[PDB]
Amino acid sequence: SGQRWELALGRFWDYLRWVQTLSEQVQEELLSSQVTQELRALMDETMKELKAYKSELEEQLTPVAEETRARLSKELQAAQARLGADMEDVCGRLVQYRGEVQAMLGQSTEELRVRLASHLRKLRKRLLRDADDLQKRLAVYQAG
């Protein structure tokens, strides 16, 4: 619904979609730490806005039993953690690539790139899946 945190995640997502192409410029920036640096910044902004959003949502809540409210807040916090961990996993996989290329000592990295692409697809599937769940939980959080 165009929340600030969603637009932030959208920018992280668009950038990652670009990285997935493994185009010439992506390949260049992947050997430097430019891609992981720009990706962590986008991840940080997303989590930052996410936290601020949750805090603001809690100003207009429907009153329920301390227990079910306490549970929904624990459930919401877990979904948040998952998202951050997903983004961290992506960054980590990209760091592994940088090192595997270096270890090749100049050899063709075409096979390494085929495998990186395959893996990134699965990691991105996981991230999208977790983002959707988090977004659904946030939508029904206030009603309790």
Side-chain angles (χ1 to χ4, degrees), residues 64-88:
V64 300
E66 221 292 81
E67 106 88 27
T68 118
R69 173 54 70 203
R71 176 177 58 77
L72 288 182
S73 174
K74 178 156 149 130
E75 276 168 5
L76 190 49
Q77 282 269 34
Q80 235 196 275
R82 239 146 50 218
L83 193 75
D86 289 347
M87 306 201 258
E88 205 43 76

mmCIF file of all heavy atoms in Angstrom, residues 64-88:
data_model
loop_
_atom_site.group_PDB
_atom_site.id
_atom_site.type_symbol
_atom_site.label_atom_id
_atom_site.label_comp_id
_atom_site.label_asym_id
_atom_site.label_seq_id
_atom_site.Cartn_x
_atom_site.Cartn_y
_atom_site.Cartn_z
ATOM 1 N N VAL A 64 -6.896 -5.871 23.001
ATOM 2 C CA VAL A 64 -7.119 -7.306 23.181
ATOM 3 C C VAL A 64 -6.394 -7.804 24.436
ATOM 4 O O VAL A 64 -5.700 -7.038 25.102
ATOM 5 C CB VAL A 64 -6.613 -8.132 21.965
ATOM 6 C CG1 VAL A 64 -7.339 -7.702 20.706
ATOM 7 C CG2 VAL A 64 -5.108 -7.970 21.808
ATOM 8 N N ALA A 65 -6.550 -9.090 24.748
ATOM 9 C CA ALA A 65 -5.901 -9.674 25.918
ATOM 10 C C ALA A 65 -4.396 -9.477 25.831
ATOM 11 O O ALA A 65 -3.795 -9.679 24.773
ATOM 12 C CB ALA A 65 -6.220 -11.156 26.006
ATOM 13 N N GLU A 66 -3.790 -9.085 26.945
ATOM 14 C CA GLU A 66 -2.352 -8.869 26.979
ATOM 15 C C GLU A 66 -1.620 -10.026 26.300
ATOM 16 O O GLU A 66 -0.630 -9.815 25.601
ATOM 17 C CB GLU A 66 -1.862 -8.721 28.426
ATOM 18 C CG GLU A 66 -0.822 -7.624 28.618
ATOM 19 C CD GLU A 66 0.493 -7.953 27.935
ATOM 20 O OE1 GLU A 66 0.608 -7.747 26.706
ATOM 21 O OE2 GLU A 66 1.417 -8.426 28.627
ATOM 22 N N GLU A 67 -2.130 -11.241 26.482
ATOM 23 C CA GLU A 67 -1.512 -12.436 25.907
ATOM 24 C C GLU A 67 -1.548 -12.514 24.380
ATOM 25 O O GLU A 67 -0.530 -12.814 23.752
ATOM 26 C CB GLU A 67 -2.131 -13.701 26.526
ATOM 27 C CG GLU A 67 -3.083 -14.484 25.635
ATOM 28 C CD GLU A 67 -2.382 -15.505 24.766
ATOM 29 O OE1 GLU A 67 -1.294 -15.987 25.150
ATOM 30 O OE2 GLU A 67 -2.929 -15.834 23.690
ATOM 31 N N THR A 68 -2.699 -12.253 23.770
ATOM 32 C CA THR A 68 -2.764 -12.313 22.314
ATOM 33 C C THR A 68 -2.060 -11.114 21.698
ATOM 34 O O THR A 68 -1.560 -11.202 20.581
ATOM 35 C CB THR A 68 -4.217 -12.378 21.784
ATOM 36 O OG1 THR A 68 -4.501 -11.227 20.971
ATOM 37 C CG2 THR A 68 -5.205 -12.446 22.935
ATOM 38 N N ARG A 69 -2.014 -9.992 22.410
ATOM 39 C CA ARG A 69 -1.311 -8.825 21.880
ATOM 40 C C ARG A 69 0.180 -9.127 21.949
ATOM 41 O O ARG A 69 0.922 -8.882 20.997
ATOM 42 C CB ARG A 69 -1.607 -7.572 22.707
ATOM 43 C CG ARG A 69 -0.763 -6.350 22.303
ATOM 44 C CD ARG A 69 -0.865 -6.031 20.806
ATOM 45 N NE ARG A 69 -2.178 -5.506 20.431
ATOM 46 C CZ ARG A 69 -2.685 -5.554 19.201
ATOM 47 N NH1 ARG A 69 -1.991 -6.105 18.214
ATOM 48 N NH2 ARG A 69 -3.893 -5.057 18.956
ATOM 49 N N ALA A 70 0.607 -9.659 23.092
ATOM 50 C CA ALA A 70 2.004 -10.014 23.314
ATOM 51 C C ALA A 70 2.482 -11.038 22.285
ATOM 52 O O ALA A 70 3.645 -11.021 21.874
ATOM 53 C CB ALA A 70 2.179 -10.572 24.717
ATOM 54 N N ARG A 71 1.582 -11.934 21.882
ATOM 55 C CA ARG A 71 1.907 -12.968 20.901
ATOM 56 C C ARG A 71 2.034 -12.393 19.494
ATOM 57 O O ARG A 71 2.950 -12.750 18.747
ATOM 58 C CB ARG A 71 0.837 -14.068 20.898
ATOM 59 C CG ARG A 71 1.063 -15.137 19.833
ATOM 60 C CD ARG A 71 0.032 -16.246 19.909
ATOM 61 N NE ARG A 71 -1.333 -15.746 19.780
ATOM 62 C CZ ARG A 71 -1.901 -15.389 18.631
ATOM 63 N NH1 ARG A 71 -1.226 -15.472 17.488
ATOM 64 N NH2 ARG A 71 -3.149 -14.945 18.625
ATOM 65 N N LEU A 72 1.109 -11.512 19.130
ATOM 66 C CA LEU A 72 1.121 -10.896 17.807
ATOM 67 C C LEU A 72 2.372 -10.036 17.625
ATOM 68 O O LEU A 72 2.913 -9.928 16.521
ATOM 69 C CB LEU A 72 -0.136 -10.045 17.620
ATOM 70 C CG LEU A 72 -1.438 -10.834 17.445
ATOM 71 C CD1 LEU A 72 -2.600 -9.873 17.212
ATOM 72 C CD2 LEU A 72 -1.294 -11.803 16.275
ATOM 73 N N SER A 73 2.827 -9.431 18.718
ATOM 74 C CA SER A 73 4.017 -8.589 18.694
ATOM 75 C C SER A 73 5.279 -9.429 18.567
ATOM 76 O O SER A 73 6.284 -8.981 18.011
ATOM 77 C CB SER A 73 4.093 -7.746 19.964
ATOM 78 O OG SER A 73 5.312 -7.031 20.033
ATOM 79 N N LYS A 74 5.222 -10.644 19.105
ATOM 80 C CA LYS A 74 6.345 -11.574 19.055
ATOM 81 C C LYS A 74 6.394 -12.176 17.661
ATOM 82 O O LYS A 74 7.466 -12.405 17.094
ATOM 83 C CB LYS A 74 6.154 -12.690 20.086
ATOM 84 C CG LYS A 74 7.251 -13.746 20.079
ATOM 85 C CD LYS A 74 7.356 -14.453 21.424
ATOM 86 C CE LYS A 74 7.828 -15.893 21.256
ATOM 87 N NZ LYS A 74 8.959 -16.234 22.163
ATOM 88 N N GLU A 75 5.211 -12.436 17.121
ATOM 89 C CA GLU A 75 5.097 -13.006 15.795
ATOM 90 C C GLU A 75 5.552 -11.981 14.767
ATOM 91 O O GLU A 75 6.241 -12.321 13.807
ATOM 92 C CB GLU A 75 3.652 -13.416 15.516
ATOM 93 C CG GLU A 75 3.271 -14.790 16.052
ATOM 94 C CD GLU A 75 1.774 -15.024 16.023
ATOM 95 O OE1 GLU A 75 1.048 -14.154 15.497
ATOM 96 O OE2 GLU A 75 1.315 -16.071 16.523
ATOM 97 N N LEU A 76 5.162 -10.724 14.972
ATOM 98 C CA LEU A 76 5.539 -9.653 14.057
ATOM 99 C C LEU A 76 7.049 -9.424 14.082
ATOM 100 O O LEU A 76 7.672 -9.192 13.044
ATOM 101 C CB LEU A 76 4.809 -8.355 14.425
ATOM 102 C CG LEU A 76 4.898 -7.188 13.430
ATOM 103 C CD1 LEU A 76 4.572 -7.676 12.026
ATOM 104 C CD2 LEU A 76 3.938 -6.084 13.844
ATOM 105 N N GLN A 77 7.637 -9.502 15.272
ATOM 106 C CA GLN A 77 9.075 -9.303 15.419
ATOM 107 C C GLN A 77 9.862 -10.420 14.738
ATOM 108 O O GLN A 77 10.950 -10.184 14.217
ATOM 109 C CB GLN A 77 9.457 -9.235 16.902
ATOM 110 C CG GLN A 77 9.159 -7.897 17.562
ATOM 111 C CD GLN A 77 10.325 -6.927 17.480
ATOM 112 O OE1 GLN A 77 11.069 -6.913 16.496
ATOM 113 N NE2 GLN A 77 10.487 -6.107 18.512
ATOM 114 N N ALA A 78 9.312 -11.629 14.739
ATOM 115 C CA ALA A 78 9.986 -12.758 14.112
ATOM 116 C C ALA A 78 9.978 -12.614 12.588
ATOM 117 O O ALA A 78 10.966 -12.917 11.922
ATOM 118 C CB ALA A 78 9.319 -14.059 14.522
ATOM 119 N N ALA A 79 8.860 -12.149 12.041
ATOM 120 C CA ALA A 79 8.741 -11.964 10.600
ATOM 121 C C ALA A 79 9.722 -10.894 10.145
ATOM 122 O O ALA A 79 10.270 -10.964 9.048
ATOM 123 C CB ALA A 79 7.329 -11.562 10.244
ATOM 124 N N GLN A 80 9.934 -9.897 10.998
ATOM 125 C CA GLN A 80 10.853 -8.806 10.709
ATOM 126 C C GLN A 80 12.274 -9.342 10.647
ATOM 127 O O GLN A 80 13.026 -9.044 9.718
ATOM 128 C CB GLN A 80 10.763 -7.760 11.811
ATOM 129 C CG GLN A 80 10.459 -6.370 11.325
ATOM 130 C CD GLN A 80 10.753 -5.325 12.378
ATOM 131 O OE1 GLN A 80 9.915 -5.037 13.237
ATOM 132 N NE2 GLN A 80 11.952 -4.753 12.321
ATOM 133 N N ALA A 81 12.630 -10.135 11.653
ATOM 134 C CA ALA A 81 13.955 -10.732 11.747
ATOM 135 C C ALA A 81 14.254 -11.573 10.513
ATOM 136 O O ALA A 81 15.365 -11.549 9.984
ATOM 137 C CB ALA A 81 14.043 -11.597 13.003
ATOM 138 N N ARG A 82 13.250 -12.320 10.066
ATOM 139 C CA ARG A 82 13.388 -13.176 8.893
ATOM 140 C C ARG A 82 13.811 -12.365 7.670
ATOM 141 O O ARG A 82 14.701 -12.767 6.918
ATOM 142 C CB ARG A 82 12.062 -13.888 8.607
ATOM 143 C CG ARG A 82 12.164 -15.405 8.620
ATOM 144 C CD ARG A 82 10.896 -16.056 9.157
ATOM 145 N NE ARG A 82 9.689 -15.539 8.515
ATOM 146 C CZ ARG A 82 8.543 -15.319 9.154
ATOM 147 N NH1 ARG A 82 8.443 -15.567 10.456
ATOM 148 N NH2 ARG A 82 7.486 -14.855 8.493
ATOM 149 N N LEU A 83 13.157 -11.225 7.476
ATOM 150 C CA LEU A 83 13.453 -10.343 6.353
ATOM 151 C C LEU A 83 14.899 -9.864 6.394
ATOM 152 O O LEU A 83 15.600 -9.911 5.388
ATOM 153 C CB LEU A 83 12.509 -9.138 6.375
ATOM 154 C CG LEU A 83 12.458 -8.279 5.112
ATOM 155 C CD1 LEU A 83 11.675 -8.999 4.031
ATOM 156 C CD2 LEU A 83 11.814 -6.941 5.433
ATOM 157 N N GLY A 84 15.333 -9.398 7.562
ATOM 158 C CA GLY A 84 16.698 -8.931 7.711
ATOM 159 C C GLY A 84 17.685 -10.046 7.427
ATOM 160 O O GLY A 84 18.686 -9.836 6.744
ATOM 161 N N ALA A 85 17.394 -11.236 7.953
ATOM 162 C CA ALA A 85 18.246 -12.406 7.762
ATOM 163 C C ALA A 85 18.303 -12.816 6.294
ATOM 164 O O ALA A 85 19.334 -13.285 5.809
ATOM 165 C CB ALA A 85 17.729 -13.558 8.600
ATOM 166 N N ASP A 86 17.188 -12.651 5.596
ATOM 167 C CA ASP A 86 17.125 -12.981 4.179
ATOM 168 C C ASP A 86 18.088 -12.081 3.407
ATOM 169 O O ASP A 86 18.880 -12.550 2.589
ATOM 170 C CB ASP A 86 15.705 -12.765 3.654
ATOM 171 C CG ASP A 86 14.735 -13.792 4.169
ATOM 172 O OD1 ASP A 86 15.191 -14.814 4.726
ATOM 173 O OD2 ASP A 86 13.516 -13.574 4.024
ATOM 174 N N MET A 87 18.004 -10.782 3.677
ATOM 175 C CA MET A 87 18.847 -9.792 3.018
ATOM 176 C C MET A 87 20.308 -10.018 3.362
ATOM 177 O O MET A 87 21.182 -9.800 2.533
ATOM 178 C CB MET A 87 18.413 -8.380 3.425
ATOM 179 C CG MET A 87 16.933 -8.095 3.187
ATOM 180 S SD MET A 87 16.505 -6.330 3.077
ATOM 181 C CE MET A 87 15.806 -6.030 4.668
ATOM 182 N N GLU A 88 20.567 -10.467 4.584
ATOM 183 C CA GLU A 88 21.921 -10.745 5.037
ATOM 184 C C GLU A 88 22.467 -11.962 4.288
ATOM 185 O O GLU A 88 23.638 -11.993 3.907
ATOM 186 C CB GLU A 88 21.902 -11.029 6.539
ATOM 187 C CG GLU A 88 23.205 -10.769 7.284
ATOM 188 C CD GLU A 88 23.890 -9.474 6.891
ATOM 189 O OE1 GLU A 88 23.441 -8.389 7.318
ATOM 190 O OE2 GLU A 88 24.889 -9.545 6.153
#
